[PDB]
Structure 1
Amino acid sequence: KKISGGSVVEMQGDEMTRIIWELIKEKLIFPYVELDLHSYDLGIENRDATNDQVTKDAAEAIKKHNVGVKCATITPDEKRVEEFKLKQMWKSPNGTIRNILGGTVFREAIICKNIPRLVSGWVKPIIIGHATDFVVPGPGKVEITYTPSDGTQKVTYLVHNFEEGGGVAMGMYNQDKSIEDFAHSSFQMALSKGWPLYLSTKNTILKKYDGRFKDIFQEIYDKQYKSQFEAQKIWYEHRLIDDMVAQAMKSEGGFIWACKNSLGMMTSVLVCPDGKTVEAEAAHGTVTRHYRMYQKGQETSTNPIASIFAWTRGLAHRAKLDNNKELAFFANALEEVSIETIEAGFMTKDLAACIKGLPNVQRSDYLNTFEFMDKLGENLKIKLAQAK
């Protein structure tokens, strides 16, 4: 008998990831989990036919039901408008979704013990979370002004006085509200993983701009989170970007990195500040190149791990909201069986290339896209059997 997963918003996408997405649902999710599924087709053809209305509806459904899992989508350009005869150059669905929900995007590289990283010392993964420009034609003043909405005196800052020749200039901003949300998402993400949190800035150069980030982070930590943080042996603390880069390379991993300023193993999750609404997806795109080969009837070897972890992160958050222990265990089992299958030597060509070097990869070093999905399916069914 299957697990009652509850309410989940699902978004179908394009090209190669759309194929893999269906394989994930039919081979790894649906055989074990029943969902109250709010499905929205964000494939490029259906967004065009609905005048992108489906994208707004899917975002609204995430706001209402708190859990969304999204397949990679085509962001249109001139060639895409030509390829599909689009009515418009529709805005990227992720841009539309982020504006409606807000929050912070956190990305995490899944680590397999037999797949090399940048540094071998990285044993645990980490989670990293994250303008008006114009040309100055010639000599003149560039100023940035603040006009208070209550009529009090305007304030003018000289950006630069070009006395000989021109150049460029730009202005940037950040609302307090968005810094607060950034902090709230970062604290809640660190708690949800039991990991310490670091915020990096350059508040020594940008003493007012980056200083506002460092200040607001400490204020919200001290009042709302410091007591829950050591209640879980963790902490939060601010670094200058120079210190944190050095600390991260000498580190083993397992920390959240709020940064102010192989693709098949990159996850993304949009964490809203309320701690309730999350949207998970792969950090890569629709893999058009493999999709062309798939269209010509040729063999593909596309890495589905990042797409699988979109589902597992969403289902893990759903289970946390609903206190669904069976679903929470299932989400973990699906992640572990994914890592273990690769660590046992069964992987797609991209990962085999990371080990042997692309010029020396042979066909017997990897599985094609369909062979790998079947290997995961068989291993998943064995694992869940051994858990009863």
Structure 2
Amino acid sequence: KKISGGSVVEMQGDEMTRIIWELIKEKLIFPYVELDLHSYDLGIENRDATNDQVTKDAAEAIKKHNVGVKCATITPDEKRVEEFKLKQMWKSPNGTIRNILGGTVFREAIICKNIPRLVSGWVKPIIIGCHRATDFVVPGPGKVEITYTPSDGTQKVTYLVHNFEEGGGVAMGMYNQDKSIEDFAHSSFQMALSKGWPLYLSTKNTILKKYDGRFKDIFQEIYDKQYKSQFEAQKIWYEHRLIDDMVAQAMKSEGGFIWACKNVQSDSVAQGYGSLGMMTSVLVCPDGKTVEAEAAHGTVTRHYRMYQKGQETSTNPIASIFAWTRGLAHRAKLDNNKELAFFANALEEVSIETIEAGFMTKDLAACIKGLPNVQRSDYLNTFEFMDKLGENLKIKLAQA
């Protein structure tokens, strides 16, 4: 008999990841854990068939059950419309999901002793947390001003945006509500507490004194009113940093901090570097309770094209495995479920250990060696890597 996992929302996706996601389910999860599974097929054809209703349902299911684990999905553009004869250019499922749950996205590279890090010298995890405008055409010369009127009618403040003198142009107004800034600090301070790392907030503070200053202020305020306690408990701390100083400190750091930044191209850097397969993602809702976990990468279309043509593929499943493990860890925490907690942690260990023992997908070998120097014998194919992880997991679980 196996573990009772409780209620999990699961979203199937597209292309190479759809394949890996099933392998993850078949080989790593279902053998050991039983779930009250709420599964939504967010494959692109099923989204088209249901007029995207399945995406909305999936999001609502996450609101209800607190835990969502999601497979990468195709975000349609014109080419995707032609390729699948879509009825419409459906919105990003991610956009729809985040819009309904709200919250803050945290990214974290999974690290292995034998895998080079972006910055040589990083030794501990780094988690990066990231945080409607009225734009119009100004058709000729004239004054654009922005005006605030308190509802108590006591005052009016008008700021000049710009005197257009030589012609027209464009202007826009933007705003943030305090609440949203509060939510972001909450998610941030809590993640720092959940991971036991210090938290830094970076802003451009000096350019937009008032806009960024309000982040600085609310973070400090919330810190001082609700976290300085627990922070000294775990022996961590919170500080604000100018982005320029933040980048510099991080350059010299050993790692082991949460980095909230007001703004982003985190994936793009991991992508160029060749380690997007190791980059995971969790959306933390303000409420402390609801999370959605997923890989940071997409559907790996290029590998899917190879697969469909019968070429061997070597696609890294780690980010996707860690979507499940962070999902289950959080489910475990809500349910005070020692067995689930043990299982999740176990699976991450197996995944990190396997790689460290020298078995890895081609992307990671390229990371070690540079792509020109990779031999087929340096890596495992997609199924080969999954089977290895499967055996090691069996072994690890058949003890203690």
Q: CA deviation at 1:127?
A: 0.5
Alignment deviations for residues 81-120 of structure 1 (CA, whole Å, 9 cap, x no partner): 1111111111111111111111100000111111111222
Deviates more, 1:163-172 or 1:371-380: 163-172
Displacement after TM superposition at 1:146 (Å): 3.1
Partner of 1:63: 63
Q: Deviations over 1:35-57 (max 9, x none)?
A: 11111111111111111111111
- Post-superposition offset of 1:332: 0.8
For 1:386, what is the secondary structure of its paired residue? coil
- For the residue of structure 1 that corresponds to 2:289, the secondary structure is coil
Change (3 A) 1:146 1:82: farther
| CA shift digits 1:179-234 (9 cap, x unpaired) | 01001100111111111111111222211101111111111111121111111111
Q: 1:121 to 1:132 in 2, by over 3 A?
A: farther
Moved more, 132-141 or 254-263: 132-141
Deviations 1:222-262 (A, max 9, x none): 11211111111111111111221111111111111110141
Q: What secondary structure does 2:255 align onto?
A: coil
Tell me by how many angstroms 1:169 deviates: 3.9
SS of 1:126's equivalent in the other structure is strand
Identity percentage of aligned residues: 100
Q: Distance in 2 between matches of 1:167 and 1:366?
A: 55
How far did 1:150 drift? 5.6
- Per-residue CA distance 1:281-324 (angstroms, 9 max, x = gap): 00000111111111111111101000000000000001111111
Cα distance in 2 between the residues matched to 1:166 and 1:287: 44
Aligned counterparts of 1:81 and 1:119: Cα–Cα separation in 2: 40
Once residues 10 and 296 of structure 2 are traced to their aligned partners in structure 1, the CA distance between those partners, rounded to angstroms, is 16
More displaced, 37-46 or 167-176? Answer: 167-176
Cα 1:150/1:88, change in 2 over 3 Å: farther
**Deviations 1:134-193 (Å, cap 9, x if unpaired)?**
565664333223355565655322112233355554432211111010011001111111
Partner Cα separation in structure 1 for residue 134 and residue 390 of structure 2: 50
Say whether 1:259 aligns with 2:261: yes
**SS in structure 2 at match of 1:74:** coil
Alpha-carbon distance in structure 1 between the residues aligned to 2:245 and 2:134:
30
Cα displacement string for residues 60-99 of structure 1 (whole angstroms, at most 9, x for unaligned residues): 1111110000000111111111111111111111111111
Alignment of 1:1-388 (within 5 A): 1-129=1-129, 131-133=133-135, 139-148=141-150, 154-164=156-166, 168-261=170-263, 262-387=275-400
Q: CA deviation at 1:385?
A: 1.4
Structure 1 window deviating more from structure 2 (128-137 vs 18-27): it is 128-137
Consecutive unaligned residues in structure 1, runs of 5 or more: none
- CA–CA distance in 1 between the matches of 2:148 and 2:81? 40
* Corresponding residue SS for 2:256: coil
Following the alignment from structure 1 to structure 2, what is the Cα–Cα distance between the partners of residues 350 and 169?
A: 45
Bigger shift: 136-145 or 206-215?
Answer: 136-145
Shift of 1:343: 1.1
1:139–1:74 CA distance, 2 compared to 1 (3 A): same
Distance 1:98 1:380 in 2: 33
> What secondary structure is seen at the aligned counterpart in 1 of 2:83?
helix
The Cα of 1:338 is off from its aligned counterpart by: 0.7
**Post-superposition CA distance 1:335-377 (Å, at most 9, x none):** 1111111111111111111111111211111111110000100
CA–CA separation in structure 2 for the residues paired with 1:137 and 1:361: 58
Q: Structure 2 unaligned segments of length 5 or more: list them.
A: 264-274
* CA-CA distance at 1:131 after TM superposition: 4.0
TM-score by length of 1: 0.96
Count residues in correspondence. 387
Distance in 2 (alpha carbons) for counterparts of 1:246 and 1:346: 34
Helix, strand or coil for the counterpart of 1:169? strand
Specify the SS of the correspondent of 1:309.
helix
Q: CA deviation at 1:34?
A: 0.6
Query: What's the Cα RMSD here?
Result: 1.8
What is the CA–CA distance in structure 2 between the aligned matches of 1:349 and 1:94, rounded to whole Å? 28
Change (3 A) 1:111 1:86: same
TM-score, structure 2 as length reference: 0.93
SS at match of 1:48: helix
With over 3 angstroms needed to count, the CA separation of the structure-2 counterparts of 1:266 and 1:152, relative to structure 1, is same
Question: Structure 1 residues 201, 20: closer, same or farther in 2, change over 3 A?
Answer: same
